[model samples]
Target: KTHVQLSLPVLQVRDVLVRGFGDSVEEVLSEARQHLKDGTCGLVEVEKGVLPQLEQPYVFIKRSDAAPHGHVMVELVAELEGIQYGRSGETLGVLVPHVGEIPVAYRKVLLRK
Candidate 1:
């Protein structure tokens, strides 16, 4: 039973749907996408969770930073489960399952290939 289907040489359309961020992630992503479209920086795809049997991959843009041109896969099962929304502002953090304290970070750009 396949959950999703994908093809190689993957083409991420300009319309990237970013999820998993508490409340601030979306805002950050919006700014980042705008910058990318305006050619201020580059396009980046942020994804989470991994199933060996699943064919569909989940990717989204979390935030934009001028750190570097690299990528990392952060398994944030803990944080996902322990997520909480603040009343005053917003806080971003992930708690892992068994691992605990799974930190999530964003990079500069993502390659569409």
Candidate 2:
């Protein structure tokens, strides 16, 4: 909760990465799998209505059991604990480089500050 920030409703991802096609997307996902972490880049901030984890926004992520479900919002809130996960369902309100906001799925849910 005190580390950094992601686009609203920012959170993490699982099931799959960003929803893109072509070799460009494929290449991004490949690298993201191994390089994805806090303060890392080379990924895409996905919008709502994607397959797999449609309940929230996500980045082009790879398969990882460590990554937990996050749904941070534009304003950001909660202690990341004692809330029973998150409601999510929001959208990326801000924008980061390489297109926009970066929603990096954590290897584990960061709740403690």
**TM-score winner among the candidates?**
2
**TM-score, model 2 to reference:** 0.22
Q: Residue-wise lDDT of candidate 1 within 74-95, one digit each (tens)?
A: 2111121234222211112211
Q: Give the Cα error of residue 28 in candidate 2, in Å.
A: 3.5
Compute each candidate's TM-score over C-alphas. Answer: 0.21, 0.22
Candidate 1 residue-pair clash tally: 6
Which lDDT tens digits does candidate 2 get at residues 23-77?
A: 3333433333323233333232455643333222222222222223462322222
Top candidate on lDDT is: 2
Where does candidate 1 have its weakest 10-residue lDDT segment? 1-10
Reference-based lDDT, each prediction: 0.25, 0.29
